[PDB]
Design a protein around this motif. Structure first.
Motif, PDB file in Angstrom:
ATOM      1  N   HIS A  12     -20.710  25.580  -9.654  1.00  0.00           N
ATOM      2  CA  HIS A  12     -19.498  25.983  -9.835  1.00  0.00           C
ATOM      3  C   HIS A  12     -18.292  25.511  -8.663  1.00  0.00           C
ATOM      4  O   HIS A  12     -18.766  25.517  -7.333  1.00  0.00           O
ATOM      5  CB  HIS A  12     -19.090  27.401  -9.951  1.00  0.00           C
ATOM      6  N   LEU A  13     -17.084  25.315  -8.676  1.00  0.00           N
ATOM      7  CA  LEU A  13     -16.252  24.837  -7.686  1.00  0.00           C
ATOM      8  C   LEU A  13     -15.472  26.082  -6.956  1.00  0.00           C
ATOM      9  O   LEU A  13     -14.970  26.722  -7.778  1.00  0.00           O
ATOM     10  CB  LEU A  13     -15.181  23.857  -8.123  1.00  0.00           C
ATOM     11  N   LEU A  14     -15.639  26.211  -5.788  1.00  0.00           N
ATOM     12  CA  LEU A  14     -15.277  27.200  -4.903  1.00  0.00           C
ATOM     13  C   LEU A  14     -13.936  27.821  -5.393  1.00  0.00           C
ATOM     14  O   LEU A  14     -13.664  28.959  -5.797  1.00  0.00           O
ATOM     15  CB  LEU A  14     -15.288  26.842  -3.588  1.00  0.00           C
ATOM     16  N   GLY A  15     -12.892  27.047  -5.200  1.00  0.00           N
ATOM     17  CA  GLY A  15     -11.559  27.426  -5.844  1.00  0.00           C
ATOM     18  C   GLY A  15     -11.215  28.031  -7.012  1.00  0.00           C
ATOM     19  O   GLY A  15     -10.869  29.023  -7.453  1.00  0.00           O
ATOM     20  N   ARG A  16     -12.090  27.125  -8.026  1.00  0.00           N
ATOM     21  CA  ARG A  16     -11.527  27.486  -9.402  1.00  0.00           C
ATOM     22  C   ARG A  16     -12.128  28.978  -9.639  1.00  0.00           C
ATOM     23  O   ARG A  16     -11.755  29.396 -10.712  1.00  0.00           O
ATOM     24  CB  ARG A  16     -11.964  26.288 -10.454  1.00  0.00           C
ATOM     25  N   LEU A  17     -13.331  28.960  -9.342  1.00  0.00           N
ATOM     26  CA  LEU A  17     -14.216  30.174  -9.598  1.00  0.00           C
ATOM     27  C   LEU A  17     -13.376  31.588  -9.100  1.00  0.00           C
ATOM     28  O   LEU A  17     -13.266  32.457  -9.984  1.00  0.00           O
ATOM     29  CB  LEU A  17     -15.706  30.205  -9.051  1.00  0.00           C
ATOM     30  N   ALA A  18     -13.022  31.218  -7.870  1.00  0.00           N
ATOM     31  CA  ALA A  18     -12.443  32.249  -7.320  1.00  0.00           C
ATOM     32  C   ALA A  18     -11.149  33.096  -8.104  1.00  0.00           C
ATOM     33  O   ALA A  18     -10.870  33.904  -8.239  1.00  0.00           O
ATOM     34  CB  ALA A  18     -11.810  31.986  -5.741  1.00  0.00           C
ATOM     35  N   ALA A  19     -10.344  31.768  -8.570  1.00  0.00           N
ATOM     36  CA  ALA A  19      -8.899  32.017  -9.264  1.00  0.00           C
ATOM     37  C   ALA A  19      -9.362  32.764 -10.496  1.00  0.00           C
ATOM     38  O   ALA A  19      -8.636  33.930 -10.912  1.00  0.00           O
ATOM     39  CB  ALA A  19      -8.349  30.846  -9.608  1.00  0.00           C
ATOM     40  N   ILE A  20     -10.366  32.350 -11.304  1.00  0.00           N
ATOM     41  CA  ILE A  20     -11.010  33.055 -12.577  1.00  0.00           C
ATOM     42  C   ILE A  20     -11.468  34.435 -12.100  1.00  0.00           C
ATOM     43  O   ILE A  20     -11.210  35.465 -12.824  1.00  0.00           O
ATOM     44  CB  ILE A  20     -11.801  32.315 -13.303  1.00  0.00           C
ATOM     45  N   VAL A  21     -12.285  34.512 -11.188  1.00  0.00           N
ATOM     46  CA  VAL A  21     -12.670  35.955 -10.779  1.00  0.00           C
ATOM     47  C   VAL A  21     -11.669  36.779  -9.884  1.00  0.00           C
ATOM     48  O   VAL A  21     -12.116  38.150 -10.488  1.00  0.00           O
ATOM     49  CB  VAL A  21     -14.031  35.559  -9.738  1.00  0.00           C
ATOM     50  N   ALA A  22     -10.585  36.244  -9.320  1.00  0.00           N
ATOM     51  CA  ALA A  22      -9.878  36.979  -9.065  1.00  0.00           C
ATOM     52  C   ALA A  22      -8.900  37.799 -10.017  1.00  0.00           C
ATOM     53  O   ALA A  22      -8.658  38.929  -9.784  1.00  0.00           O
ATOM     54  CB  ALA A  22      -8.949  36.510  -7.973  1.00  0.00           C
ATOM     55  N   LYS A  23      -8.888  37.211 -11.027  1.00  0.00           N
ATOM     56  CA  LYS A  23      -7.996  37.662 -12.001  1.00  0.00           C
ATOM     57  C   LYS A  23      -8.696  38.809 -12.892  1.00  0.00           C
ATOM     58  O   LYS A  23      -8.227  39.958 -13.398  1.00  0.00           O
ATOM     59  CB  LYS A  23      -7.511  36.577 -13.176  1.00  0.00           C
ATOM     60  N   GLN A  24      -9.983  38.355 -13.007  1.00  0.00           N
ATOM     61  CA  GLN A  24     -10.856  39.192 -13.843  1.00  0.00           C
ATOM     62  C   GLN A  24     -10.960  40.567 -13.146  1.00  0.00           C
ATOM     63  O   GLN A  24     -10.947  41.707 -13.871  1.00  0.00           O
ATOM     64  CB  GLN A  24     -12.241  38.797 -13.872  1.00  0.00           C
ATOM     65  N   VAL A  25     -10.832  40.934 -11.928  1.00  0.00           N
ATOM     66  CA  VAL A  25     -11.261  42.116 -10.830  1.00  0.00           C
ATOM     67  C   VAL A  25      -9.759  42.934 -10.994  1.00  0.00           C
ATOM     68  O   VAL A  25      -9.637  43.884 -10.858  1.00  0.00           O
ATOM     69  CB  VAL A  25     -11.812  42.008  -9.763  1.00  0.00           C
ATOM     70  N   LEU A  26      -8.634  41.857 -11.080  1.00  0.00           N
ATOM     71  CA  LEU A  26      -7.266  42.493 -11.222  1.00  0.00           C
ATOM     72  C   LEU A  26      -7.088  43.352 -12.386  1.00  0.00           C
ATOM     73  O   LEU A  26      -6.395  44.455 -12.416  1.00  0.00           O
ATOM     74  CB  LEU A  26      -6.069  41.611 -10.932  1.00  0.00           C
ATOM     75  N   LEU A  27      -7.372  42.720 -13.660  1.00  0.00           N
ATOM     76  CA  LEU A  27      -7.498  43.330 -15.004  1.00  0.00           C
ATOM     77  C   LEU A  27      -8.530  44.526 -15.184  1.00  0.00           C
ATOM     78  O   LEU A  27      -8.449  45.005 -16.095  1.00  0.00           O
ATOM     79  CB  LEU A  27      -7.852  42.269 -16.165  1.00  0.00           C
ATOM     80  N   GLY A  28      -9.153  44.663 -13.908  1.00  0.00           N
ATOM     81  CA  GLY A  28     -10.095  45.919 -14.004  1.00  0.00           C
ATOM     82  C   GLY A  28     -11.741  45.753 -14.459  1.00  0.00           C
ATOM     83  O   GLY A  28     -12.463  46.593 -14.521  1.00  0.00           O
TER      84      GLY A  28
END
Ligand SMILES: [Mg+2]
Ligand SMILES: [Mg+2]
Ligand SMILES: [Mg+2]
Ligand SMILES: [Mg+2]
Ligand SMILES: [Mg+2]
Ligand SMILES: [Mg+2]
Ligand SMILES: [Mg+2]
Ligand SMILES: [Mg+2]
Ligand SMILES: [Mg+2]
Ligand SMILES: [Mg+2]
Ligand SMILES: [Mg+2]
Lengths: 109, 176, 148, 199, 50, 138, 135
Positions: D10-26
């Motif tokens: 996985h590419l660092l930045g792209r995974l973080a963006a998706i992972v960041a949104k998932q944890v913001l949605l709870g």
RNA sequence: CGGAGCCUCGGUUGGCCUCGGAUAGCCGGUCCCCCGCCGGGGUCCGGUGCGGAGAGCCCUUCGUCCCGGGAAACGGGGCGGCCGGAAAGGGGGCCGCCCUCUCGCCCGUCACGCACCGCACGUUCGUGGGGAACCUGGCGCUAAACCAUUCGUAGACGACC
RNA sequence: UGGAAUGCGAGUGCCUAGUGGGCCACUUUUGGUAAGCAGAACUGGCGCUGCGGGAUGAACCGAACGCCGGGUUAAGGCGCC
């Protein structure tokens, strides 16, 4: 018996970037990730359900700690399945990222 | 002119307004590639003005109509003669394209001239468009499709449905 | 707004954004429209545009007031002396630029249109440049549907 | 409940963006094998990027931050923290819904790992482009447990191979069983084929 | 402006903080790297400065 | 390694676009990205089509490049591509998908019952087979 | 919603139970039956906006429903409290239940596994989304 | 280790118990052949818009009753032991038991249950977390820390030895 | 036949405060190497003015403001913040 509502997340309020319109809520619904899959849900009932300290009456039941703010889906939002919902009172900000229930009525099918 | 969407070929006929000296002025015609007709008429007056002592006030458009592709279901090679202004001069170019409609080849020209030379459509003057036989083409990129037994695979097929599902148990396959 | 544009926009009666008016064309008026070219979108309306404009958004200027044209008597009392006595006569006078276009048109209040549903391309440049300003000829009708 | 992701490929930045949104949605997210993460661009230019980051320090008291974490898990964690409003209670609560690991320790070693095809290097990078490994990068900016993580990841894979062989053994029996009871389940198999569940 | 004449700084910043030690008995921060080929042996001891 | 090639006559399956789910034949190649495809027996007009929306199948009809629609349909009938396609495992999996997608609520209930019983019979047999292999080792 | 259609009730104590549509009363409320012997839903009124109509139907074209089963028949009878007062199933209601059920029930049993379907209850489970599935 | 409740805190409303990976290549069998402490390579055969598919799989809940038909019989439920787990260690499977049922699953027959008279917060995880207490049985435990004193390897006072 | 178009109700008189440091932008323009410099013309702005965008900002871009609901837009945007 079993679940009779769809799982939705209270994503946030209606807003620009620096202005917040708390009277409208943005709902993310499980499995709805396109604007064309939101049509089934428009007009459906929504329920933020939570618990408090003091017991409150329950329709058709005895007092308990459950409480609910009712609302309904008014329209789709964006290209990715988000819907705008309006509630009888603006949702508390503590509810962001938590479960919102979406009912199967008023049924149009 | 903004090369918005797929362009269309227009046949525009205009003339000087008749006057006592010349009761019947001669008619002029131009091939105009534009998004719509309102743009087509505007560019006509820009070109005839450059060639004749004429302009919208002292002339009229006798006919504006879309020229349809004559063989839309046949592959052709197009030669496009154009002049354009760069940041530091004016240049003439000859380009070739493979398409089904002459207006499609011209639309390819604008997107290509923008890509390879940062040329906005207001600096490009398409002088001439011709359909060219495979034997008369000059550009190696076009000539390599003149092969009766052409064949080639599609290697490394990129996954384009990358968010349905967004999270999955299996990794994609690029070989098909 | 520059002083010359500001005066010409008041003479056209377009004192507010997304206000609409009919104008009968001639050398006097076409040259006025050139001055306010950056500030207007105009074109040639077809019969359906004249209909829907006057029916949905038609208000008469009666006793210097804005009165919705909900009754034919409203037209007849004011424009009856010119034999304009019904909405159809008012639509006919406007569309064909009758002998009393000036009176029938000034009688109509400037049409208050809504923001274009679907957006605009670029209000700050001409139509032929891919924007919105200036003369777009019959393409005004597509705009009128999205605003009426 | 918990979305478990595999960090390998996985590419660092792209995974973080998706992972960041998932944890913001709870949603609770666990990312494992953070040393398997990739970064677009050759290794040297990615090493330079971190060495420049290492130079950022409070001139008057370096102990006061920025803190330069050397583990690939913490490097990824700080990348996800950069895509969150982490100075508000909402952002910190979201940040607490993420767990990041080097290798695959228990209990996630014995759980299925999902991927994110929108962040997969094979999906997002032209095959000719160079890329870097977060594990090699981290090891070369002071990470101390590259060799141990690999040694323990070598033991887990040997155990996973044994588990798979057992699963293949049980599937071979299953296909054999479907043949032995073909007559007793024929009627139920037509119901499934009638409705697409069996092709 | 630059200081007129150069001079090394006083003290080593590698021994900071200059604080009272938390331990009275000296801690072995790093033992010798184990070599599996050597016979079993001990690597440290305690003595008292006489 | 490549087994399927974009070539004149190759039959492709259209995955997305206005003609998704249909079969077309490559009549000619325009450039690196587009082909002239034709679907006379599958209700697709001759037109340009990006290679992105296609998926090459294993069939290859025989007709000259850019031959007009009469002979593309003619070769399609000779090879009976419509039945050959529907007999492939590829076609069957598409049919299996839409049968399951259109399942009625009652149908869903019947499948659950059939699946529930079938899964029990198989599991019981698998236990006996597990026991069988144990004795051979013992 | 055509007569004989199987509806899923969404509200009330009978929510999630699959019932048989009989007819629409003069007030627009729907008349449904369990039948009582399959899911314990009697001749009952329900609102159309609060049901999901499935695609499963039975032919009750030849069933004769009593004409006295009207909105007034099903309207609640107020009970006065001064302790409580309990609703009592009138004998006429029981007679009507058997009259209608004795005709609809054999038609249910013609369709294989249909009776078991009417005993089950509808629910949403993991990965099942209403907008995706046909009823 | 083995009862009723009472406060208070919230969220949630089936589970997926796992090859490693490649991506200009993969997956499953075949062991008939070659190697090795049953596994690796080869050959051979199958799939590959992945169907031995996460576009998936598992579980599926109205309860009871009477009597049939398929399916089980190598079966379900319930006390003793042995392999096995350390990166942040398993209320998994298996061997015995004395017991306990032929009901669990599928299709039918036969009726019943508050059928509360259209309606919300229903439906779990839930013997949930934490806090006081009240019991009521058994098996177990009877410590240190700080001050004060003393030391001077320490020290502005604290601290430290 | 109130003699071009268009729009608009006009005329007129007393008493009158504050102001009389300005500054900025397109175009034109003087001095100066130039200056976020000094000095002019035109219009428009800030000053007196919030609001959306330009991350941030007197002036830029959009648009000017009674207290609200719904809808749609401008200039700008749509990986995550
Ligand atoms: Mg819209
Ligand atoms: Mg401007
Ligand atoms: Mg260090
Ligand atoms: Mg010096
Ligand atoms: Mg609850
Ligand atoms: Mg100045
Ligand atoms: Mg002042
Ligand atoms: Mg002012
Ligand atoms: Mg302002
Ligand atoms: Mg900026
Ligand atoms: Mg509004």
């Amino acid at each position: 018996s079993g679940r009779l509502w769809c799982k939705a997340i209270f994503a946030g309020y209606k807003r620009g970037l620096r202005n917040q319109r708390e009277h409208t809520a943005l709902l993310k619904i499980e499995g709805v990730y396109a604007r064309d899959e939101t049509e089934f849900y428009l007009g459906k009932r929504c329920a933020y359900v939570y618990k408090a300290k003091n017991n409150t009456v329950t329709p058709g039941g005895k007092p308990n700690k459950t409480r609910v703010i009712w609302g309904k889906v008014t329209r789709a939002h964006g290209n990715s399945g988000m819907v705008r919902a309006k509630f009888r009172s603006n949702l508390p900000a503590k509810a962001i990222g938590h479960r919102i229930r979406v009912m199967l009525y008023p049924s149009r099918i | 002119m903004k090369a918005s969407g797929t362009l269309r070929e227009y046949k525009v006929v205009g003339r000087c307004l008749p006057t006592p000296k010349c009761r019947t002025p001669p008619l002029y015609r131009m091939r105009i590639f534009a998004p719509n007709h309102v743009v087509a008429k505007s560019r006509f007056w820009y070109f005839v003005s450059q060639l004749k002592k004429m302009k919208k006030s002292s002339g009229e458009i006798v006919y504006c109509g879309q020229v349809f592709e004559k063989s839309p279901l046949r592959v052709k090679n197009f030669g496009i003669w154009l002049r354009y202004d760069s940041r530091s001069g004016t240049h003439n170019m000859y380009r070739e394209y493979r398409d089904l409609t002459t207006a499609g080849a011209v639309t390819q020209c604008y997107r290509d001239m923008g890509a390879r030379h940062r040329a906005r459509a207001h600096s490009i003057q398409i002088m001439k468009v011709e359909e060219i036989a495979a034997s008369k083409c000059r550009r190696p990129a076009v000539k390599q499709f003149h092969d009766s037994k052409i064949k080639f695979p599609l290697p490394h097929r990129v996954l384009r449905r990358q968010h349905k599902p967004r999270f999955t148990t299996k990794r994609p396959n690029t070989f098909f | 707004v520059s002083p010359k544009v500001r005066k010409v926009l008041q003479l056209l009666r377009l004192r507010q954004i997304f206000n609409g008016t009919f104008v009968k064309l001639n050398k006097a008026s076409i040259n006025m429209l050139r001055i306010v070219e950056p500030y207007i979108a105009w074109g040639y309306p077809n019969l359906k545009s004249v209909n829907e404009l006057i029916y949905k958004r038609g208000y008469g200027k009666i006793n210097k007031k804005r009165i919705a044209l909900t009754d034919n008597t409203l037209i007849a009392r004011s424009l009856g002396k010119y034999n304009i006595i019904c909405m159809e006569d008012l639509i006919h006078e406007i569309y064909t630029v009758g002998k009393h276009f000036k009176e029938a048109n000034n009688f109509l209040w400037p049409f208050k249109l809504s923001s274009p549903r679907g957006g605009m391309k670029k209000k700050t440049t001409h139509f032929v440049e891919g924007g919105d300003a200036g003369n777009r000829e019959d393409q005004i009708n597509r705009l009128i549907r999205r605003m009426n | 409940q918990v979305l478990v992701l595999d960090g390998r490929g996985h590419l660092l930045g792209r995974l973080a963006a998706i992972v960041a949104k998932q944890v913001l949605l709870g949603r609770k997210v666990v990312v494992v094998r953070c040393e398997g993460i990739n970064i677009s661009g050759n290794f040297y230019r990615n090493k330079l990027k971190y060495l420049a980051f290492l130079r950022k320090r409070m001139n008057t008291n370096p102990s006061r931050g920025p803190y330069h974490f050397r583990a690939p898990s913490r490097i990824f964690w700080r990348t996800v923290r950069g895509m969150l409003p982490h100075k508000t209670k909402r952002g910190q609560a979201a940040l607490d819904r993420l767990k990041v690991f080097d290798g695959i320790p228990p209990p996630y070693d014995k759980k299925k790992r999902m991927v994110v095809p929108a962040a997969l290097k094979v999906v997002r990078l032209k095959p000719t482009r160079k890329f870097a490994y977060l594990g090699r990068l981290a090891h070369e900016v002071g990470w101390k447990y590259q060799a141990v993580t690999a040694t323990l990841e070598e033991k887990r894979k040997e155990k996973a191979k044994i588990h798979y062989r057992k699963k293949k053994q049980l599937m071979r029996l299953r296909k054999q069983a479907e043949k032995n009871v073909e007559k007793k389940i024929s009627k139920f198999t037509d119901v499934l084929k009638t409705h697409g569940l069996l092709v | 402006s630059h200081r007129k004449f150069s001079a090394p700084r006083h003290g080593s910043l590698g021994f900071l903080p200059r604080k009272r030690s938390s331990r009275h008995r000296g801690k072995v921060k790093s033992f010798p790297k184990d070599d599996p080929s050597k016979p079993v042996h001990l690597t440290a001891f305690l003595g008292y400065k006489a | 390694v490549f087994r399927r090639f974009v070539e004149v006559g190759r039959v492709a399956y259209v995955s997305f676009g206005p003609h998704a789910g249909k079969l077309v034949a490559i009549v000619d190649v325009i450039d690196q990205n587009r082909a002239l495809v034709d679907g006379p027996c599958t209700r697709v007009r001759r037109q340009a089509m990006p290679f992105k929306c296609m998926q090459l199948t294993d069939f290859i009809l025989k007709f000259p490049h850019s031959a007009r629609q009469k002979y593309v349909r003619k070769a399609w009938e000779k090879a009976d591509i419509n039945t050959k396609w529907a007999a492939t495992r590829w076609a069957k999996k598409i049919e299996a998908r839409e049968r399951k997608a259109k399942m009625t609520d009652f149908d869903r209930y019947k499948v659950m019952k059939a699946k529930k019983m079938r899964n029990r019979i198989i599991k019981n047999e698998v236990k006996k087979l597990q026991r069988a292999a144990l004795l051979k080792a013992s | 919603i055509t007569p004989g259609t199987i509806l899923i009730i969404l509200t009330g104590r009978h929510r999630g139970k699959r019932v048989v549509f009989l007819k629409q009363l003069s007030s627009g409320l729907l008349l449904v039956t369990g039948p009582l012997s399959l899911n314990r839903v009697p001749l009952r009124r329900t609102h159309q906006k609060f049901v999901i109509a499935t695609s499963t139907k039975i032919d009750i074209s030849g069933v004769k429903i009593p004409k006295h089963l009207t909105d007034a028949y099903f309207k609640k009878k107020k009970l006065r409290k001064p302790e409580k007062e309990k609703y009592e199933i009138t004998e006429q209601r029981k007679v009507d239940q058997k009259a209608v059920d004795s005709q609809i029930l054999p038609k249910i049993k013609a369709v294989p596994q249909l009776q078991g379907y009417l005993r089950s209850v509808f629910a949403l489970t993991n990965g099942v989304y209403p907008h995706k599935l046909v009823f």
